[PDB]
């Protein structure tokens, strides 16, 4: 079985003696010494440690030196890591390290030949220990006060960001609040210690996002001083002091000193084996009629099959088996309904929309245990075996015995391919009574009857009745002949003289009343399809009746007493008073808590939603209607009896009608993931910024807009301080400002927009002679040109200039400007056709002026017609070898204008010896001016203002796209198939005779919650793991006024800092000790928040737990749990109405513990279900109301502080990484419904 | 301690169990005998392999690679308290092991023997040397006898036979009539040169006056390498020693043409071809 | 800067945004030593400088330098 | 068969061959970085650059034309 180590071909000497190369083979599997590495889990992969390569390289150096690692204090210089290496769960990866002993250079290859890490290393001759000082700013008399960050606190903030560091790597013990000081733990592993120092670097206050190492400038390790610099905690463990000096960019710890350790951004890769199950929690009646009628597809079919077939009284069966019978125009008639007879799960014939899940469900909580034996007769044609294994596998607490029984072995043949993965027991069965051993008694029996109708009514049911198990369930589905199609099914496929064999609603009603059943449910469709749930009842015992209306929680010791009653079969819980008595949630806990498992714990609820809805009395006629039905879950909304059910959510990303929107990418590098996101001006336009509004007729892409929508360029190399690295596209536009005026302007980002906020120092009036099109092409292009040529390269007239890519935007402009002050131009260009456009557009161009651009030939060319002197300025925007070649065209005193960013960005080498030509090299970034609009920017603007009035500057060729084809506008620009600008149009301009229009822009825009900066937002428990994140996320989406509630106040360092920092970012934050369970307390709170600004947000995250099974529960373990949630919610509902006329969000976190239940949280359950009522009330009143039933919550929940990982399987679910929660909550907030679930699936 | 075991030694431990039980004996019935073990081994490539990385490579590799361990560790496991020995004579070895063994039983010393032949190809260098001596067939075949012989074609093999005194054998493939070894003196044409004038002598020492009848031989299994020099020199000396006798004296063959030249394993791997075809 | 190897490199790192390096030195220049191009994202501009390149090439620029003296 | 490309090659000291005796130059290659280096017996740096196989050998680069008779 087991295979062993066979020395390998390459294991034996194959070159010779070589002190200077080393191959390391890393094995990560649980046995290996190098298993420790599996704790360097970044974003969920196991990357081999940035630090790691240095450790190898180091090792490798002492090899060559004959010395060990502890005697060879090393120096790295200019180290650069290129890709990181992903360690596979199993197998071996090889990194090879090569040394250049004279050049001091070094390199790290991989098995595949790729470059991994390069720098310079060498023995460090005069190891100056003074380089590792640990001397402070002064004597801190602050032990016992302070506020530090605990190892837990630290990796809390990291794992939040994407760093899933594991134990052997969690070496940060303690940290200054700012992360400038602290204590790292020694492991006897440099790879760990080293990477922990990196931690601290990465660990800035208020620095978000995922950061890998990329360059060090100078690492210096001296293991002697290191042994010394180390100490021993009382723990008996070993650690030393780390210090970060961000003003000097140096991290020191023990004997390792970093310098210029530049790290950088990485893309979080969404692992879609963790997409969340989004469910809506609508109330559902048992008595649903006229169902559907919302499908344009199903109504374009009760007339396309009641129109060709109404003359006898396209895609699917009744359309294809009825039309192919009028095509040949009874023996071959059963031969044209069979090349399309398995074309029978047809949209109309089959009612798989919501109804099916609504009843399967009802059936499913009506057995003690979440295990369910299911069987399905007539399984072949009526394929319920396709849907119900899916509807059920949906819940987190499931166990399924599916059994597909069919008359023949034939009909279960196409299912061998399908039944093998749903895992379905098969057999043979014809509805004639005989229930085999191959059925052994079930729980549910399902049956599609829009089928080869069984032939017999109560004989088919005499079997289905003889496979019950105590009181299980029967789901059956017949087409009813009291409709235009119901009798038209009977005639067709069953040529039989009694083919009209499909009774009506009353006729099936007493066909069940015969087997001793009770219609549990009924789903009458509009076209005639009807769904029947049926349960047959075994006698009731002594039905105890306990009302749960009190606020006391007395009934608690009364349900703790009804656990002494032997087999008390009927024990019914029922609120009569409070329309907010969260029993539904309670039940779900007890109903599977050992004590009441088989207790048949039932519920009754009074939830009238408007005032004129009276109708709830016990002891009389209805009490017994419901006792007869026996159903576990009995609710009542304004007329209907139905439980509370879970349905899937409508998926579609909620859009909205706006006059404002900006276009963003939804996934860095995939252009399909582009759509119209909602503009934050669509949420509030506060007088302040308002006198600056501007409606856009044309927005134009530039190259940066592409390289980002692609991902060749990191949002790193974009100047500016950025709240959100998210929204970042478009900087040029043209329209009318709030004056009505006619303007063209630039914008630091979010320019691709229906509207924009005019940067006043960088908006210009567009002349009368320029269309809005032509205007929208100029701003960037020219400014980048004037800034490059004139301001920076100080170009003087009659010089020579090499402008690369003349066709381009910057190109055309460059030329125009150089030609105006009359220079010898030399341009490069890829197309034979671009040679054309240019030659035309500028007549003053010779054929000597043109060289290529996809190639190095341009150098030789410039060197010819320059007599080996070269050009005076170069405007290079080209890459690697081409940039180098562009450098060589520099004549004496010349100036390089580096507009490009790639070679720059990768810290490529520049041959310093070029600077003997008294050359000056200009790095250039227009984005470094702009927003920061200084003197220099003004200088560049009036170069535009002037060049305009002197006709130097002219609009470019505009290749214009409609606001729909925004996508292609990008790909078109991608493949360099453009000359001039690419411009996306938003408003057809206003024609001839001078119009002062006023635009009616309706636009299709995806919803994204944003916060007006004048409203104040309130989260209770705002210092709690999640709250802190909700706060963070709030500030990001705009909030300026937060009110964070907690009973104690700021007590953790990790809070101290989040709040301390938000204050520094300018956010107005207010920590409050006001408790919302007392009305006086609530008002205190809302009034608190109102002093900050009208209240727009109220999120109730507070919660105290009291875990204990029902026999430990006291009536005040119960009252404690609901005070923060039910009582708090209720008060905030009242207070909110009384005086919060600007509230948009009223949110409340529930849990799935209310949904499917949790054993030992019968109290948690109640309290939470309670809130879901109060939120439903509000929705019904047209007020914002949203309760979310979260599953396990990761990254920071009560979970991560109690139990352990994001790998903990709780309630049959997984921790939703907060990141995902936030983007879910984002979806939820803009929803109609009152109650929504969200959890991840375990296994 | 097993991932540091020369794969020879691994599958020796098995083939010799497979061999002891092959002949109706329970290995345990031997536990503690005066039973010996004789291994013909030329190349222990695996040993160098796990002896280069002086931080990486562990100390108990040598208890699983040192040559003697090829026999010693086979004695260690079966509890064979008699002689434990590995011999290296190059291509012969295993056959001279199977000789050295036969003698030790014959003479009283033992009651049973494990005779092993081992040779596994791991390091390409080895072969490269053999080519730079032109004893390797570019062809890559052991054309035995045929005129189309360049050199031989190296192959591997772990093989073992169990020798026993008849009054202890539950099965008998054949009986050993005689054996002996000599050694080409100082040939004037180099050390690689197979001296037939000396192989004849060996073949004599064992027959006519001090052995069986050259006339009884039905089959002689040659070495049959496929050397343009080796083949003639041998086959010539063969007839010049076994052939004053009528009928087509000895049909001749050579497993080495079927499978390659297992070098030190050749002899015993050869014997196995012989026993097999007898059965 | 008029300093050498590691000191020149270190002098480069003192550049603030929009800063200007005046390379008066000639050693690192003369040996075609590498310059970390990524420094040019600070919108820095790097000046190679040789007064001997004007000196007898007494052009306009030289005059400008003279009247700064005058 | 290995048409080569050098780049940025740089020679640092040259090597003086003595009337008699043997001198050693060691050449080291960095196969991923394309870099290369030449040491001597004494450890000194002699020559450094970048080399590699030249994939698309464009013979038109060896044009000895010129339209100046
Ligand atoms: N630093 C700043 O402030 C600043 C400002 C603006 C622009 N820029 C940079 O300057 C460059 C030019 O910008 P632009 O908007 O003026 O030019 P553009 O019209 O958007 O297109 C860039 C040019 O690059 C050339 N090119 C060569 N290969 C290409 C390829 N494979 N795909 C697309 N284009 C290719 C194209 O000309 P050919 O096909 O003729 O070669 C094209 O004309 C951009 O790379 C941009 O990043 C910098
Ligand atoms: N974590 C999960 O897996 C999960 C799952 C489902 C639902 N949830 C939701 O998560 C919320 C909180 O859980 P979490 O782990 O994110 O945070 P948490 O740290 O456990 O939040 C609880 C905090 O709320 C505060 N609080 C308690 N009673 C209060 C009161 N009466 N008035 C004001 N503040 C009060 C307490 O602050 P003090 O420090 O001052 O006492 C306490 O630390 C709950 O509302 C729950 O619905 C979480
Ligand atoms: N490119 C041009 O057009 C141009 C023109 C003139 C001068 N220069 C350059 O400017 C630099 C200074 O020239 P200068 O006329 O002003 O010379 P100087 O200052 O009179 O003397 C040279 C200075 O170099 C410093 N230095 C650093 N290490 C030294 C060492 N190991 N030995 C001696 N001095 C050392 C000394 O200052 P410390 O003791 O404080 O270290 C000394 O003050 C020179 O390096 C020269 O190459 C360039």
């Amino acid at each position: 079985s087991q295979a062993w180590d066979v020395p390998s071909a390459a294991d034996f000497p194959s070159g010779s003696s070589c002190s200077s190369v080393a191959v390391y083979k890393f094995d990560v599997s649980p046995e290996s010494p190098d298993h420790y590495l599996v704790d360097h889990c970044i974003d969920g992969r196991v990357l081999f440690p940035g630090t790691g390569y240095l450790w190898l390289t180091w090792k490798t150096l002492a090899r060559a030196l004959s010395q060990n690692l502890e005697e060879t204090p090393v120096v790295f210089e200019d180290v650069t890591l290129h890709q990181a290496t992903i360690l596979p769960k199993t197998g071996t990866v090889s990194l090879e390290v090569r040394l250049l002993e004279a050049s001091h250079a070094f390199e790290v290859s991989d098995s595949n030949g790729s470059l991994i890490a390069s720098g310079k290393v060498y023995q460090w001759e005069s190891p100056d220990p003074k380089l590792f000082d640990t001397r402070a700013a002064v004597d801190p008399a602050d032990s016992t006060a302070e506020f530090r960050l605990s190892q837990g606190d630290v990796y809390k903030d990291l794992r939040l960001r994407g760093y899933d560091y594991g134990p052997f790597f969690q070496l940060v013990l303690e940290s200054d609040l700012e992360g400038n000081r602290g204590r790292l733990q020694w492991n006897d592993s440099w790879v760990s210690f080293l990477d922990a120092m990196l931690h601290m670097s990465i660990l800035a206050p208020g620095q978000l996002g995922l950061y890998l190492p990329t360059r060090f400038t100078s690492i210096r390790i001296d293991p002697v001083t290191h042994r010394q610099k180390l100490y021993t905690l009382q723990d008996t463990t070993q650690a030393a002091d780390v210090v970060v000096d961000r003003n000097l960019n140096t991290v020191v710890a023990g004997g390792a000193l970093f310098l210029g350790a530049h790290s950088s951004v990485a893309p979080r890769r969404p692992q879609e084996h963790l997409k969340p199950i989004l469910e809506k929690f609508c109330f559902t009646p048992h008595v649903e009629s006229g169902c559907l009628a919302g499908n344009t597809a199903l109504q374009e079919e009760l007339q396309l099959c009641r129109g060709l077939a109404q003359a006898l009284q396209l895609p699917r069966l009744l359309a294809a088996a009825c039309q192919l019978q009028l095509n040949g125009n009874l023996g071959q008639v059963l031969a044209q309904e069979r090349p399309l007879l398995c074309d029978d799960p047809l949209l109309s014939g089959l009612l798989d929309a919501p109804a099916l899940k609504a009843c399967v469900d009802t059936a499913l909580e009506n057995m003690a245990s979440p295990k369910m034996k299911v069987v399905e007769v007539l399984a072949g044609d009526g394929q319920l075996y396709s849907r119900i294994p899916a509807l059920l596998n949906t819940q987190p607490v499931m166990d399924l015995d599916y059994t597909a029984t069919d008359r023949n072995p034939q009909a279960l043949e196409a299912a061998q391919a399908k039944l093998e993965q749903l895992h379905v027991t098969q057999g043979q069965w014809d509805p004639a009574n005989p229930a085999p051993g191959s059925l052994g008694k079930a729980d549910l029996l399902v049956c599609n009857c829009a089928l080869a109708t069984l032939g017999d009514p109560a004989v088919a049911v005499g079997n289905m009745a003889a496979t019950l198990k105590e009181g299980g369930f029967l789901l059956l589905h017949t087409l009813l002949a009291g409709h235009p199609l119901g009798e038209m099914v009977g005639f067709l496929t069953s040529p039989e003289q009694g083919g009209r064999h499909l009774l009506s609603q009353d006729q099936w009603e007493s066909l069940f009343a015969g087997a001793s059943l009770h219609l549990v449910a009924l789903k009458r469709s509009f076209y005639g399809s009807v769904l029947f749930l049926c349960r047959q009842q075994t006698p009731q015992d002594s039905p105890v009746f306990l009302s749960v209306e009190d606020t006391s929680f007395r009934w608690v010791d009364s349900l703790k007493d009804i656990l002494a009653d032997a087999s008390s079969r009927p024990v019914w819980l029922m609120a009569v008073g409070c329309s907010t008595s969260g029993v539904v949630g309670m039940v779900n806990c007890l109903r599977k808590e050992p004590g009441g498992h088989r207790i048949r714990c039932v519920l009754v609820s009074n939830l009238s939603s408007t005032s004129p809805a009276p109708e709830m009395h016990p002891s009389s006629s209805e009490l017994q209607k419901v006792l007869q039905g026996d159903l576990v879950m009995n609710v009542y909304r304004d007329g209907a009896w139905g439980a509370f059910r879970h349905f899937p959510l409508e998926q579609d990303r909620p859009e909205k009608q706006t006059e404002h929107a900006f276009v963003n990418v939804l996934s860095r590098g995939d252009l399909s993931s582009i759509r119209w996101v909602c503009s934050p001006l669509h949420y509030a336009l506060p007088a302040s910024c308002q006198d600056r509004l501007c409606s856009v007729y044309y927005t134009s892409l530039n190259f940066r807009d592409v390289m980002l929508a692609t991902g060749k360029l990191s949002p790193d190399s974009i100047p500016g301080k950025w709240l959100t690295r998210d929204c970042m596209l478009g900087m040029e536009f043209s329209g009318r400002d709030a004056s009505g005026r006619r303007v063209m302007g630039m914008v630091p980002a979010e320019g691709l927009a229906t509207s924009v906020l005019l940067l006043q120092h960088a908006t210009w009036e567009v002349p009368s002679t320029w269309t809005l099109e032509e205007a929208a092409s100029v701003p960037i292009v020219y400014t980048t040109a004037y800034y490059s040529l004139v301001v920076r390269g100080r170009m003087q007239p009659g010089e020579s200039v090499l402008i690369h890519s003349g066709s381009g935007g910057v190109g055309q402009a460059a030329i125009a400007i150089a030609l105006s002050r009359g220079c010898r131009v030399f341009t490069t260009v890829g197309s034979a056709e671009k040679r054309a456009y240019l030659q035309a557009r500028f007549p003053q161009l010779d054929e000597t002026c043109f060289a290529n651009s996809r190639d190095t030939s341009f150098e030789q060319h410039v060197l010819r017609h320059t007599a080996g002197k070269g050009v005076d300025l170069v405007l290079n925007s080209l890459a690697e070898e081409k940039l180098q070649a562009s450098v060589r065209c520099l004549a004496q005193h010349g100036r390089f204008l580096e507009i490009g960013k790639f070679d720059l960005s990768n810290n490529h080498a520049l041959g310093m010896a070029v600077f003997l030509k008294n050359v000056t090299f200009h790095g250039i970034l227009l984005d470094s001016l702009f927003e920061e609009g200084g003197a220099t920017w003004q200088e560049v603007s009036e170069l535009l203002k002037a060049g305009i009035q002197e006709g130097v500057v002219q609009p470019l060729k505009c290749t214009v796209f409609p606001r729909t084809k925004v996508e292609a506008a990008f790909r078109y620009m991608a493949q360099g198939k453009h000359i001039g600008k690419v411009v996306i149009q938003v408003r057809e301009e206003e024609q001839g005779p001078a119009p002062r229009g006023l635009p009616p822009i309706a636009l299709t825009g995806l919803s994204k919650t944003f916060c007006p900066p004048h409203k104040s937002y309130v989260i209770t428990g705002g210092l709690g793991g999640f709250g802190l994140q909700l706060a963070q996320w709030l500030r990001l989406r705009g909030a300026q006024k937060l009110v964070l509630t907690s009973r104690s106040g700021i007590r953790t360092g990790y809070q101290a800092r989040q709040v301390r920092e938000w204050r520094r970012q300018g956010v107005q934050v207010l920590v409050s000790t006001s408790n919302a369970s007392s009305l006086d307390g609530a008002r205190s709170l809302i009034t608190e928040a109102t002093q900050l600004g009208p209240v727009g947000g109220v999120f109730n995250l507070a919660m105290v737990l009291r875990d204990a099974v029902l026999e430990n529960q006291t009536p005040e373990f119960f009252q404690d749990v609901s005070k923060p949630k039910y009582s708090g919610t209720a008060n905030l509902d009242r207070v909110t109405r009384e005086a919060c006329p600007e509230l948009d969000y009223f949110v409340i976190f529930s849990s799935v513990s209310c949904g499917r239940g949790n054993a030992g949280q019968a109290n948690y359950g109640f309290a939470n279900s309670a809130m879901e009522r109060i939120c439903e009330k509000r929705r019904h009143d047209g007020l914002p109301g949203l309760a979310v039933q979260w599953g396990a919550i990761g990254d920071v929940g009560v979970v991560l502080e109690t139990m352990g990982t994001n790998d903990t399987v709780i309630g049959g679910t997984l921790p939703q990484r907060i990141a995902s929660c936030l983007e879910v909550l984002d979806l939820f907030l803009s929803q109609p419904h009152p109650v929504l679930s969200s959890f991840v699936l375990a296994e | 301690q097993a991932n540091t075991m020369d794969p020879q030694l691994r599958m020796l431990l098995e083939v010799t169990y497979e061999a002891i039980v092959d002949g109706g004996i329970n290995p345990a019935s031997l536990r503690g005998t005066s039973t010996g073990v004789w291994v013909g081994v030329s190349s222990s490539d695996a040993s160098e392999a796990l002896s280069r990385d002086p931080e990486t490579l562990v100390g108990y590799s040598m208890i699983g690679c040192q040559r003697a361990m090829m026999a010693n560790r086979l004695s260690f496991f079966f509890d064979f308290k008699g002689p434990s020995i590995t011999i290296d004579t190059a291509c012969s070895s295993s056959l001279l092991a199977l000789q050295s063994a036969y003698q030790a039983i014959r003479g009283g010393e033992c009651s049973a023997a494990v005779v092993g032949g081992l040779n596994v190809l791991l390091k390409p260098n080895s072969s490269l040397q053999f080519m730079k001596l032109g004893m390797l067939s570019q062809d890559g075949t052991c054309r035995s006898f045929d005129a189309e012989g360049t050199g031989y074609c190296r192959a591997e093999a772990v093989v073992a036979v169990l020798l026993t005194k008849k009054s202890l054998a539950r099965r008998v493939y054949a009986t050993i009539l005689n054996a002996g070894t000599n050694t080409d003196g100082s040939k004037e044409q180099g050390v690689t040169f197979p001296s037939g004038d000396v192989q004849e002598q060996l073949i004599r020492s064992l027959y006519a006056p001090a052995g069986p009848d050259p006339e009884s031989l039905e089959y002689i299994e040659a070495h049959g390498t496929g050397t343009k020099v080796g083949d003639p020199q041998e086959l010539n000396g063969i007839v010049n020693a076994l052939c004053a006798t009528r009928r087509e004296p000895l049909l001749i063959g050579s497993t080495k043409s079927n499978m390659g030249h297992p070098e030190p394993a050749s002899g015993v791997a050869a014997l196995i071809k012989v026993l097999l075809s007898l059965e």
Side-chain angles (χ1 to χ4, degrees), chain A residues 60 195 330 369 458 468 605 832 1070 1113 1173:
Chain A
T60 300
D195 189 79
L330 303 192
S369 49
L468 178 88
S605 192
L1070 210 185
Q1113 215 72 2
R1173 301 323 139 206

Side-chain angles (χ1 to χ4, degrees), chain A residues 737-763:
Chain A
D737 66 9
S739 317
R741 229 161 88 200
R742 215 161 144 266
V743 287
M744 108 214 78
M746 298 163 94
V747 136
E750 286 174 57
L752 286 166
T754 323
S755 55
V756 128
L757 288 203
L758 285 213
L759 284 227
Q760 191 159 357
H761 50 283
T763 285

Side-chain angles (χ1 to χ4, degrees), chain A residues 304-613:
Chain A
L304 200 65
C305 292
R306 190 213 149 199
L308 296 158
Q310 184 199 44
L312 186 62
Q313 252 165 318
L314 299 182
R316 279 133 33 249
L317 184 57
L318 265 204
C322 174
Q323 291 160 15
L324 280 163
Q325 189 162 24
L326 305 159
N327 266 359
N329 277 322
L330 303 192
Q332 299 170 16
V333 158
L334 299 170
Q336 196 57 27
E337 319 147 350
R338 312 282 199 187
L340 307 155
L341 186 96
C342 291
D343 190 10
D344 217 335
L346 108 66
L347 202 71
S348 193
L350 298 203
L351 178 66
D352 54 337
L356 308 197
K357 167 94 174 182
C359 317
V360 171
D361 265 3
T362 308
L364 184 46
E365 39 197 344
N366 290 34
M367 39 213 49
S369 49
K371 76 161 190 153
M372 205 166 76
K373 308 178 198 174
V374 192
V375 190
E376 200 214 327
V377 192
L378 301 196
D381 294 323
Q383 312 177 343
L384 303 160
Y385 80 95
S386 174
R387 311 166 171 175
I388 308 187
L391 293 180
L392 292 173
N393 280 5
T394 271
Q395 234 146 29
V397 279
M398 253 300 90
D399 183 278
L400 200 57
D401 270 31
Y402 209 62
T403 310
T405 343
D406 247 16
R407 309 184 178 208
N408 326 320
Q410 244 187 345
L412 307 167
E413 186 195 346
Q416 302 282 6
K418 263 193 160 181
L419 286 182
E420 139 254 318
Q421 301 152 357
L422 299 151
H423 305 281
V424 180
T425 310
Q426 31 186 16
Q428 271 152 33
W429 234 108
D430 198 338
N433 283 304
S438 289
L439 226 53
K441 279 124 208 175
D443 278 298
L444 170 77
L445 179 37
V446 208
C447 192
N448 200 21
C449 227
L451 236 53
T453 293
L454 319 127
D456 291 39
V459 147
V461 180
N463 145 54
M464 317 274 169
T467 321
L468 178 88
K469 198 178 174 180
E470 300 159 351
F473 291 95
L474 260 296
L475 214 35
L476 344 154
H477 179 129
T478 303
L479 302 156
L480 275 220
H483 290 258
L485 302 173
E487 84 205 5
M488 302 207 64
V489 184
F491 285 78
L492 213 58
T493 296
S494 185
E496 288 165 344
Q497 284 212 14
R500 303 177 189 183
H501 54 238
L502 303 168
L503 318 155
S504 262
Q505 299 227 357
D506 277 1
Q507 300 204 339
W508 287 98
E509 204 93 33
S510 59
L511 185 40
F512 304 118
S516 298
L517 297 154
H518 192 93
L519 252 201
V520 159
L522 175 55
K523 311 295 175 189
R524 178 194 316 164
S525 167
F526 77 96
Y527 61 83
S529 176
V530 177
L531 213 48
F532 301 100
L533 195 43
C534 294
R535 168 174 221 177
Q536 45 180 30
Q537 192 80 10
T538 296
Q540 69 137 37
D541 289 289
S542 65
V544 192
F545 287 133
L546 177 38
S547 189
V548 182
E549 176 191 355
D550 210 334
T551 328
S552 280
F553 287 104
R554 310 177 186 185
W555 62 80
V556 171
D557 291 335
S558 306
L559 285 191
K560 221 184 137 196
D561 283 338
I562 317 187
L563 210 26
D565 202 357
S567 303
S568 63
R569 200 191 176 178
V571 194
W572 291 54
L573 278 211
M574 64 220 38
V576 203
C578 274
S579 258
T580 58
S581 178
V583 181
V584 176
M586 261 213 83
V587 171
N588 276 301
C589 294
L590 296 325
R591 177 96 213 173
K592 203 205 169 191
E593 211 181 33
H597 204 75
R598 263 304 183 198
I599 272 197
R600 153 56 49 180
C601 323
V602 186
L603 43 162
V604 195
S605 192
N606 319 162
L607 285 215
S608 297
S609 285
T610 330
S611 220

Side-chain angles (χ1 to χ4, degrees), chain A residues 1125-1138:
Chain A
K1125 287 197 162 151
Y1126 162 106
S1127 308
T1129 290
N1131 280 349
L1132 284 146
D1133 179 26
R1134 187 164 177 188
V1135 182
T1136 257
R1137 305 202 187 195
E1138 272 171 339

